[PDB]
């Protein structure tokens, strides 16, 4: 599965980069680590 690095934008949407920045709905990604206020964290897609 590809890992995303996502953060709050400048439903809920996250600003994510792959592996160049795309906006994903929070419902379509799954945190891989604690989500952070004002910081990025890693996610995977809900399909994978």
């Amino acid at each position, epitope marked *: 599965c590809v890992t995303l690095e996502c953060r709050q934008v400048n439903e809920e949407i996250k600003n994510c980069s792959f592996n160049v920045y795309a906006l994903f709905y929070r419902l379509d990604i*799954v*945190p891989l*680590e*604690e*989500e*952070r*206020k*004002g910081n990025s964290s890693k996610y995977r897609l809900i399909n994978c």
Partner: antibody
Amino acid sequence: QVQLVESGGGLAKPGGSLRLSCAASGITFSEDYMHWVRQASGKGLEWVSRISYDSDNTWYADSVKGRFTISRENAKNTLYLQMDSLRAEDTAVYYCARAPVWTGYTSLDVWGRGVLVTVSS
Amino acid sequence: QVVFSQPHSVSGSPGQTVTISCTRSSGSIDNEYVRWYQQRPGSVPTIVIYKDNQRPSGVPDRFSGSIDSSSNSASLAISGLQSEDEADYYCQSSDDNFNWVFGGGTRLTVLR
């Protein structure tokens, strides 16, 4: 639902060593961050330690760093806390707690019933 | 080390609004999410508020959380106080080393 049942602990002397165990029912353990939190009688909650679902990342409160070791065994839905170099001030009820994916691993929604640890000469 | 300081005690009468503050001693309150837990007598804590101001399903809307950057504080407001709200309340965040930290806790009395 998910239920957490702590076992182990008990009485020990300063400098002694105990192991806590926590058995989790349910289906989410292998994806949950797991925490230990303790509470001395009549005192506030004190966060102790946490471990990622894949055991690769652990954190410890300054008060226990170097003396406690958190670990888990996902195939058995079990969390551990190895408590070495015990001090009287480690006396407290210790709670197993789950930080699940739905909170972004940010909050403890399910707590165990607790296990007493008493350190005394 | 960082301390999240709460009033030792708060009291209100049924139906009133009460507020519980949580003041971070060092750093910025906005560096990390604040959470709030309720611990009723003889029971384990439950989540009231996470991610600063989000309520889990089942938590009544009379609980709300807020952040005040200018005072480096977070607050839990309970409107329409009810008898079952008598509990200890703890804020929770994390520090510069990414260790989680609870506030000292507040005992809320519903005067009856």
